[model samples]
Target: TFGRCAVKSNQAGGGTRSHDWWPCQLRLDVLRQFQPSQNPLGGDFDYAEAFQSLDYEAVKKDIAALMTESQDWWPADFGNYGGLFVRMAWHSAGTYRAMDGRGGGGMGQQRFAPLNSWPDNQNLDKARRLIWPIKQKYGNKISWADLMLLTGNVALENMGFKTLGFGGGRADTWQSDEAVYWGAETTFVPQGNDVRYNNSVDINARADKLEKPLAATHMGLIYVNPEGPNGTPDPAASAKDIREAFGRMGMNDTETVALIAGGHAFGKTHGAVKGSNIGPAPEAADLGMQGLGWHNSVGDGNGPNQMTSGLEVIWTKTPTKWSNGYLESLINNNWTLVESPAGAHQWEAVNGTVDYPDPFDKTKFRKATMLTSDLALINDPEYLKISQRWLEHPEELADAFAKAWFKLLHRDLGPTTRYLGPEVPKESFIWQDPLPAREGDLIDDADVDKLKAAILSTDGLDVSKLASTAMACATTYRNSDKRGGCNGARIALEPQRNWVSNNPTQLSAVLDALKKVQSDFNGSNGNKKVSLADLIVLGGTAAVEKAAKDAGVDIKVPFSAGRVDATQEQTDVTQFSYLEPQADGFRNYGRGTARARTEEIMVDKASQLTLTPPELTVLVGGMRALGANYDGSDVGVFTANKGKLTPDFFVNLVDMNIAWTASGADGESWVGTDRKSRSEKYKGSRADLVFGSHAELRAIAEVYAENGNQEKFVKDFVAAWTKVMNLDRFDLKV
Candidate 1:
């Protein structure tokens, strides 16, 4: 049995600059021959020599060992290309569009000054050329686009990011080269220039060169609005305006936003071309006045602040990095004005004053300069066109971005996880990759049913007894907790025996029956030593049976008034459905697995829990316990209506927190009980008992709604659950 892995070593030794042959650094001592200056450039850029110096066999062995630890890691669908890779490529490409009219620096294109000299490009000749070697080796086997994407994929994986799976078939044509211009050109748009009013023609022309159409909302839902002052428009309004504009083009808002955002993630801003910093910036000074071009017309009074006030002509900070962080910064008031790099300034008048105020500042303006379509003071059609493009070609751009992104970020799996690419499911918890079933590989119903039963049944159950009287007795014993209590067979026989009319009332009656059973067990009336705790164990069994029924599992059990005379019959509890801790992680068992097995159940939970005070309490209490110290004082309170509680009260509470508090409150609240509060004060109390085990917690939660004060019960449960679950190891580090 052998395995493989990747390993790195600093090999020493070598020959003179004139003699290209160099000795491995690691082998220097063993070989008894070492030379430093002999190898000029310190063997740093010696691609071939450096690569061959390592022990390939040993590296593979190490990779194999690592893979043995986690065999489930795989790639995502949407094929090998996921959003992460596309963003990386866009980020890498975006850096090239600096104010100096240069692009593609990180890609090593600087080697070719001719291409490097392009106004909207930097040094990326090496990036464009380096892939040749890989292509030569994998040539007849892979597409050029695939090779390019793999480049990014390699970079990401080598850099410690997760591996992104991608497919190959893309041609190595001049399409990207042609599309590069549009990406560079859209970087800058002058404020008062006629081009600022409507550059959709130019935009479309660039898109056309790439053999692609502009999305109505640009890559991921970005739309242009000329009505905005200086071409600046509000994102909140842009979504709505883009919607109306998209309607004319027969597209929806979601499609429009997704496409534009995706495109913007790929493209860059050139101060000389678009007169605005539309994406991330590689440097701070590049966005300052020093980088300003003589032809550039970016000013505070009458400038092209179109689309977004935060967007100014010059450098785009983090331009080569595409992550949700950019979107978040926009939502928050933290974007820096690229045009006024000297100090804090705002491009929008409505954004309020800068941290350092200068009321009449000519070059600087307020952060809120009314970034809405009304601010641009221009044609609606042009903006509409931008919106239309985004909605129409979102998928195409997504695909393109995916290719570029993967090449920048590659993953190196151990031998065990070898070459797991686009073949895996994207939703698999084992790895963050996409794995979709082949069109004709659908599983048969009977086979699937058999598997489901196996999965649902605890490992200790006897399959042969599924329909036997022994199984019925076992169901009763397990569900009713033996000493005579609620039985699994009882609930099934309830309707036939006329327990209750329908599902709703039947559920209610079942709740009542359980309560009665608990009360009876609590009494000292009989010679039995049975207690409420015993009743809970029995009730849980009954619930499990109901759950199986709900899941469409077939099984036969005895029933008698929802009760079982266990004393008269000796039967074993079915242990088949029991979940083991070591068998699978917590996520693989109990409620976690249950939720995945049934999305409808999760959705129902989400829907039913909506704005309830108990849920809110849980949200706030959990967050607080999790160390989300709001108010900067480590105080996060769970508030409730002192008067009659209503949904409106919860809404108002949320709004007040949002508007008034700095740290504010998370959107979750709930009502609590006196008993829960008391139990919470103790470490190993009843609260701990229920919260210690997920089964206990879930059982308690199910019975919670049946409790007289549903809201209060939930609140108490949440508080208890939070306390127990928020312990040291229970807190998920990720």
Candidate 2:
């Protein structure tokens, strides 16, 4: 009875269900029509049945075409009909055992009365029409139950819902007549009769002859009445009451639990129509319902029992399948209630503990549960089998049910039953398993080359196909790099050298070579200040042991002297002013430059001939003047300290252009200006030229002086400088 069973029936050599067929039986022929070339099962649907009966080769080709074209259905595109078909299938089968088994999901009861009008059937019409064509083509070969289940299978696979599975053998029958049809005529008895205490009375009760149970509910079956004030239905009581009522129907408690959970495959509800607002959380809203708390207010005053009533109850996650999670809902207290006016008191009663352990607080009981074996209760053999069967044959089942109920009952096919053939393939399907997803699988070179050869032989040198070989090679190389190796195909000799080679001796040679070039330049030109850029190039030529060690190179060179800057002005001899550039600020002016001036002097002495405060201050003023007025100079106002110099004077000079190097550490100062008659002087006017700090200068001087005898100074400096320039030295022929 599953959709696959229907498909098998319509294949090359198959038969139909019963002889007394209805117009909806045309669905079997509809499916048959797609076969041969378009065997819905096969990927291709190119009107093959029109050409011939049914051939295996043709079917194979059709399948191949189907596989090829249906690839687009992969990755679960929303527009695919396959998923919708599957949904339709499950929804159809989801209604298993209904009131008294006389009218239940076993016969695809959703197609019949009462069940059809339930709010959950909102889209049922659309689903039926969609698969109508299939039913017309594959008529009688499938049962409504089988078709619905198969459709579910195909759709779930296509949409990426992987955890589900299904089997076959579901039947279609004309069990319900016009009198019992699921229309508005169905209603609760005016006085209501109790059917909960006994099983025989509940099971034998007829549709119109029996009184509705106050505590009435169903996971898959449609409840006529539940235990409560008779008004609207109760959704919360739906699960509890349905299971209990099933127990009363000669079914064991475990069977009731399993069957209800299995219905999760297709059953869904709508809050607006069912008087319950238990929309599927974390999933599509109308797909299923939550618990039995009132989700919507019908009368607004909380008058009568305000219990939720609808087919929309379900666990938070995994709405597509039934599992332990539904039981876990009770365990985790994640169960939520919606506001409604159906069977609120009964819902509260059953929703609470079955029997109190110690205290009798109803609120506490509401929070706790008496059943500790939720898993055992749901894992009954019957329950697992039903779910597995539905999962396996989703598409076939969906189509079967659509044709049986929607087309047969409604006479007019709904959208869901409009089609009979198998769904088209997709590009990518959502892989529902809990594995890491991949963008796409990588193709190997051999596979690519073989394909290319086949393509070229068949179509005369296809460029795109030929490119596959190169693409594979490139991809392989990149993959290798990602796996912890460098790309090999793109490697060149020079690039290889750059990445791997570390030549120390060559780096040592650059310093001596540059020194010679500088000497030649000096000989031809007059003494001039070397710009920051030129100095960097010069510094890079130096080779040091540390440099060679760091870069894994060896070098030997000689030391030489050179002038850094030329200046006639020097600080007074008596002042012990130690001028050093601020390390942080000095770098801004390049390696050869000094830091900005310090506010305090190097020392207080008479001979400190540092730039005067006015001179340094004037320099800044002059620069600003130049910046503001491009060419004009307002420099006449500033004066220089001819003989009597002070720390303020030097600070001012550094601030102005007259003096450039700012002392890093404290420098010498004169004590005259405002406090004394005589001025103090300091030494080391060119301290900033040596190093940023006295310590830095001393360290460099010590290293150079100590290593000079070993010829390590020049070599190390050259190596260090070469590395600084980011250039290769070993490969340099010159």
TM-score for each prediction? 0.24, 0.27
For candidate 1, write residues 1-734 as lDDT tens digits.
11111433335532233223332111111111112333333423332233234333343233223222221111111112222333334333333221111232232222232233323222122233334544455433443434444555443343233443542222222211211222312333222123222444333222222211222233111233423222333333444444443332223334334334433332222122242433331222254422222222343311222222222321112223343322222333333223333221233333434432121233452232212332211223453444345335544435433443332222111011112233222322211111122222223433333323432243322211111111122211110001111222332232212311112333344334434544443333333332222222233323223322432333332111112222111222211111011111101111223212222222222221222223423332222222211111222222232111112212322332232211213211122223533321111111111221233233333443242543443345334332222221101221
**Candidates in order: C-alpha RMSD to true structure:** 29.5, 35.4
Q: What are the per-residue Cα lDDT tens digits for candidate 2 across 318-431?
A: 333323434344333422333322322221123543332111122331122211122223234554444355445544334433333221121111112112334312221111
* lDDT, candidates in the order shown: 0.28, 0.29
What lDDT score is found at residue 49 in candidate 1? 31
For model 2 the local lDDT of residue 59 reads: 31
Query: Highest TM-score: which candidate?
Result: 2
Error of 2 at 679 (Å): 99
After superposing candidate 1 on the true structure, give the runs of residues whose Cα lies further than 4 Å from its correct spot.
1-133, 152-164, 174-324, 334-734
**What's the TM for model 1?**
0.24
Best by lDDT, which number?
2
